[PDB]
Structures are given as structure tokens and as C-alpha cells.
């Protein structure tokens with residue numbers, strides 16, 4: 001069975017040089033070779049047709065992200081350079097506990113207001129790559145809505161950590177949330193977003209937190225121990241009409257696929273009772289045993305089983321690429337999910 | 345000239361805080377809040393024979409914990425050790441924090457705790473930060489005791505500074521809110537009410553937050569517009585307190601190129617608010633980064649204006665503790681800070 005992949009070469013326009021890590025500025029983990037290695041394996045395995053995204057404009061993006069946030073991402077680098085800063089655009093101050101969530105005028109204050117971390121430098125081309133990556137997800141969703149059983153959105157930058165008006169965790173536009181909202185806007189009554197990336201999809205959770213029409217599930221490492229730290233706990237089950245439409249399943253270091261799979265089954269069962277009309281899978285392969293910044297122990301073969309189990313949900317499915325940082329295996333791992341899904 | 349009567353408290357342990365990196369404009373550069381700041385001010389204290397100089401008494405963490413939460417104090421004692429133990433190779437700097445929409449929930453990992461307890465990433469923690477912050481609170485508390493025991497005023501030559509630290513948040517180069525700690529010590533010793541006046545260029549956000557719902561401590565700050573400058577998310581003029589504290593916080597905000605003539609009009613307003621409040625003691629959070637030559641200032645105070653500031657503060661007629669806050673160590677840093685004390689003493 002074949003599956004189409006949407007890939008944009010514009011991802012390379014985001015090529016930052018610094019990442020704040022352990023008190024030093026290091027080479028960034030979320031680097032362009034990630035997207036190129038997955039794309040190469042897609043070709044090598046003849047998974048299916050590869051296409052460039054169509055341009056949907058900011059309309060579908062602003063169905064999820066606030067107008068102010070979108071404007072800020074467009075002008076942030078220019079404002080940063082104009083203000084005389086010499087590094088890449090990195091937050092120095094933020095709304096600390098006890099302060100007001102009030103938007104200030106200065107670039108440093110806006111940059112903290114709209115962020116949850118300092119590891120996600122902004123520079124020239126970030127706006128364009130974030131736009132292109134959102135259009136990648138939207139093209140995959142159009143492919144599925146127009147007849148494809150599934151499509152692979154090879155997004156870079158990733159998306160699942162981005163709130164309606166907060167960037168961080170290498171994410172700017174929540175590609176999965178945008179594709180989910182695209183389904184809803186096109187008449188799909190109910191959408192599930194399943195987050196199998198190693199880290200919590202905190203952005204997706206926040207975006208739909210008070211809603212029952214989009215079910216949000218994430219499996220991830222314990223946020224007591226890893227990013228995002230301040231969301232992702234198992235007591236976060238929604239609010240208002242969204243109560244019982246968010247589900248976090250956390251795991252500790254050294255978790256093997258046998259145990260992680262038990263969490264997947266719980267997720268799948270919650271999807272079954274929810275009975276959605278479409279599925280968005282925010283796919284990260286940083287659950288891999290050789291991932292440099294994560295502590296699960298999945299093997300490359302386990303990604304074939306993952307894709308097989310997702311296919312058994314029987315839903316229209318859009319895969320949005322999130323994390324995964326072992327550059328030798330990232331291509332093999334991600335395409336294995338797709339090949340698993342296609343019965344291979 | 346003869347030795348004056350304004351005593352200065354100074355701890356050599358301030359040099360235990362001596363960090364190598366500061367995040368600024370996307371670069372890790374040499375920090376702006378250097379040990380030479382306190383040494384150069386101290387040299388002017390000696391050179392002007394302002395008064396006796398003494399080392400602080402050790403008061404212990406008790407008076408610190410009248411202002412700061414126990415969890416936060418424990419965090420600052422262990423932060424460096426936890427950071428090294430987790431394998432980080434740089435100084436201890438927040439990478440993630442409680443962004444809008446996330447929970448104010450304390451996590452286990454050192455990275456999460458660093459972010460939970462911080463409002464900024466320009467304030468690296470390293471070895472000796474705990475000890476220097478402790479010594480600096482003791483500097484303020486020794487100054488408070490000197491005034492409680494009979495002195496009209498004393499100068500707490502604190503480093504690191506304190507006015508940006510909340511009960512459980514550090515940032516803006518500050519760890520323990522020395523001014524607040526001294527204000528609470530006045531209160532704990534039977535002074536019915538205390539006013540804390542912040543003349544540093546930046547908003548005293550920590551002090552405001554600490555007493556924000558209280559009427560027994562009046563908090564006033566003059567500062568550059570937080571729309572433009574740190575701390576950005578507090579310090580606006582509509583923050584007037586809450587609950588019992590309503591009308592007991594006053595922020596006085598100024599734009600770029602503000603001259604002493606206009607800054608003094610806000611100082612007159614602050615002094616009037618202190619007069620009708622009628623406190624039993626006054627704590628002045630003194631920054632000299634209002635100086636026209638301070639690299640982060642956009643006020644136009646001259647060195648002579650600091651003499652006029654000190655004279656005006658004396659006219660309040662209050663028992664007064666000065667805690668040293670900000671001010672870059674351009675050549676005149678000590679001239680300017682000590683000018684405040686000499687003007688208070690009648691120069």
C-alpha cells in the first residue's frame with residue numbers, strides 16, 4: 001500500500017545557529033538534516049508520491065492562533081535586529097509567577113510574553129519556514145479529505161508545543177491543531193489528535209482544552225522530569241465542555257515498548273468510544289532508544305507495529321512530523337510508521 | 345574632612361557571587377552586575393569619610409523567611425549542586441518557564457525548578473551565589489539593627505541587589521529582597537508601619553508583590569516605563585494594591601529623556617504619599633542607574649542631583665535604611681551613591 005508525503009524545501013529557511021542548553025549556546029537539535037533524512041528514506045523506500053504544499057494563506061492558521069501572535073512571528077526578527085541585538089532572537093525575560101499577562105511594547109517583552117522557553121531561537125526565515133510547515137500539514141489534510149486514507153505531512157519546524165499564542169519547544173504554528181481545525185471547518189464533526197511524540201503535546205492540549213469536539217491525547221515522558229514540565233500531568237482532563245476530552249498518559253525513564261503499548265491501547269480505546277470522523281497523529285520518533293534527549297526504549301521495529309496499530313483504528317489519518325533527533329535513524333523510524341500503516 | 349555619622353555595612357562575601365556569563369541580546373556575555381560595583385562604591389565611602397564601615401552580623405535564615413517562602417530558600421541553597429549533578433556544563437540559567445496557559449506547579453527536575461522560580465534568564469546562578477545572597481540580606485539586616493538601636497540612618501551596601509525578587513522568584517540580578525527583609529524586620533520589632541521607596545531606575549516589582557495585599561507596608565517606586573524596559577510585566581500606574589493593600593502601592597512611571605526636574609516631581613508625589621501614610625520607618629531601595637551616564641538609563645540625572653535626592657529624603661524626618669540596588673560601575677558610581685548619603689547628612 002502507498003501513501004503520499006507532503007514536503008516543502010522552504011523548511012531550510014529556518015537554519016538557526018544557537019540553542020540555549022545547560023547554560024551554553026550549542027548547535028540546535030532541531031536541525032535541517034532531520035527533514036532531509038526522512039525525505040531521503042521516503043524516496044528510498046518508494047513510500048509513495050512526494051508533493052510540495054499548496055499555499056493556504058494565514059486564514060487556516062488564524063483559526064487556531066491569535067492574530068497578535070501571527071503578526072509577532074512575522075515581525076519579530078526585524079524588530080530584534082532593529083533594536084540592536086546581536087544574537088539570534090532569544091527571550092531574556094518573561095511573565096514570571098506574580099506578574100501580569102499584559103502585552104508590552106518593547107521587543108524583549110513581547111518575546112517573553114509569547115514564549116515558554118529560551119531554547120527556540122528565532123532568526124531570518126523562521127516566519128517563512130513556519131508558514132511552509134503549516135501549509136504542509138494543510139495539504140496533507142486536503143489530500144485525506146479529498147480521498148486519501150492517510151497522508152504524511154513532513155513538517156519542519158514541528159508544532160505540538162505551540163499554544164494559540166505561545167511558541168516554544170522548537171514549535172511555532174501547531175501544525176496538528178491546524179489540520180485538526182481544518183477537518184472541523186470542512187464538516188468533520190469530531191476530530192482526535194493522538195500525540196505519540198516523546199514529549200507532551202502541551203500546545204495541542206491548551207488549544208482545544210475547553211472543547212469536546214476535538215479529543216486530545218498524548219503519551220509522553222513524565223513532565224515532572226522532562227519538558228514541558230508545567231503541563232502534561234495525568235490530572236489534566238479538560239475544562240468546561242472539554243472535561244474528559246483530554247487524556248495524558250505519562251511514563252518514567254527506561255519505559256519499553258511493552259509498557260508504552262499499554263498506554264497506546266488506553267489511547268486507542270478512548271478514541272474508539274469517542275468515535276471521531278478524522279485522526280491527526282502528531283508523530284515523534286524521539287521515543288527511540290537512541291534518542292539523545294529522551295528516555296524511552298522503542299526499537300526501529302516497534303515503529304512498524306505502531307503504524308500497524310494506528311491503521312487498525314480505521315480512520316482518515318494525517319501524520320504531522322514532530323520530534324526525533326537521532327539523525328541516523330530518524331528517517332528509518334518515521335517511514336517505518338508509514339510502512340507499518342500501509343501493511344508492510 | 346572628618347568622619348561622618350552615616351555608617352555603611354559591607355560584606356566581603358559579596359565577591360562569592362562572581363558569574364562568568366549573562367544572557368543578553370541572544371549572546372552569553374560578561375555580566376553587567378560585577379563585584380567591582382560594590383568595591384568602587386566602598387572606595388568612595390572611605391575616600392569621603394562618610395562614616396564607620398562594619399561587616400554584617402549573621403542573623404540566620406529566620407528574617408529572610410519572614411519574606412521568602414521556605415521552598416524558594418531551599419531551592420537557592422541547592423540550585424548549583426543540583427545543576428552540576430544533572431550534568432549541565434554552563435552556569436545555571438533557566439531554559440523553560442511557566443508560560444501563559446501552563447500550570448504554576450513545582451516539578452522535580454532541576455530545569456523545571458529553575459524556571460518555576462525565575463522571571464528571567466539574565467541572572468546566572470553559580471557557586472557562591474547562595475552565600476553572597478545570604479551575606480547581602482545580612483548587610484540589610486545589620487543596617488536595620490543599627491537604626492533600630494539609635495542611628496538616624498544607615499547604608500546597607502548590598503550586593504547582590506534585591507528589589508526584583510518576589511517571595512519565591514529571582515531575577516533581575518536579585519535573589520533575596522534585602523529592602524523587603526529590612527522592612528519586615530522593622531515590622532517584627534514593633535515598628536507599626538514601614539514605607540519602602542524605590543528610586544532605582546527599574547520598578548521594584550519584587551517589593552510590590554511581597555506587600556501588595558498589605559496596608560502596613562507602603563511600597564512606592566519611580567522607574568522607567570515597563571512598556572519599554574524591564575520588568576515589562578509589572579510596574580504600571582494602575583497597580584494600586586489589592587484587598588487591604590488597595591491604595592498602598594504607588595508606581596510612578598517616566599519616559600525616555602526624563603530630566604531631574606520631572607523625575608523630582610514624582611519624587612515629591614512619593615514623598616507626599618509617605619507623609620500622609622506617616623510610617624515609623626523608611627527603607628530606600630537606592631539604585632543609581634538613573635544616572636545620565638548609566639548605559640541602561642534613559643533618565644538624565646547628574647551627579648549633583650544625587651545630593652539633592654539625599655537632602656529631600658532626609659526632610660521626611662524618618663529612621664531610614666538605604667539598601668544598594670542597581671547602577672553600572674561607570675567611574676561615577678561611587679560618587680553618585682555616596683552623594684545620596686552626604687546629601688542626607690547635610691552636604
Ligand SMILES: NCCCNCCCCCC(O)(O)C(F)(F)F
Nearest residue numbers: 020021119158170199227322323
Ligand atoms: N536546549 C534545551 C532544549 C532541550 N529539549 C527541549 C524539549 C523539546 C521537545 C521538542 C519536540 O521533539 O517535542 C518537537 F517536536 F516539538 F520538536
Ligand SMILES: NCCCNCCCCCC(O)(O)C(F)(F)F
Nearest residue numbers: 367368466505516546574669670
Ligand atoms: N541581559 C539582560 C539584562 C538587562 N538589564 C535590565 C534589567 C536589570 C535591572 C536590575 C537593577 O538595576 O534594578 C538591579 F538593581 F537589580 F541591579
Ligand SMILES: [K+]
Nearest residue numbers: 195197199219
Ligand atoms: K506525546
Ligand SMILES: [K+]
Nearest residue numbers: 208211214245
Ligand atoms: K479537548
Ligand SMILES: [K+]
Nearest residue numbers: 542544546566
Ligand atoms: K524604582
Ligand SMILES: [K+]
Nearest residue numbers: 555558561592
Ligand atoms: K502595600
Ligand SMILES: [Mg+2]
Nearest residue numbers: 106107108109
Ligand atoms: Mg528591551
Ligand SMILES: [Mg+2]
Nearest residue numbers: 290326328329
Ligand atoms: Mg546510532
Ligand SMILES: [Mg+2]
Nearest residue numbers: 225453454455
Ligand atoms: Mg532537565
Ligand SMILES: [Mg+2]
Nearest residue numbers: 536537622624
Ligand atoms: Mg502611626
Ligand SMILES: [Zn+2]
Nearest residue numbers: 197198199323
Ligand atoms: Zn519530542
Ligand SMILES: [Zn+2]
Nearest residue numbers: 544545546670
Ligand atoms: Zn536598576
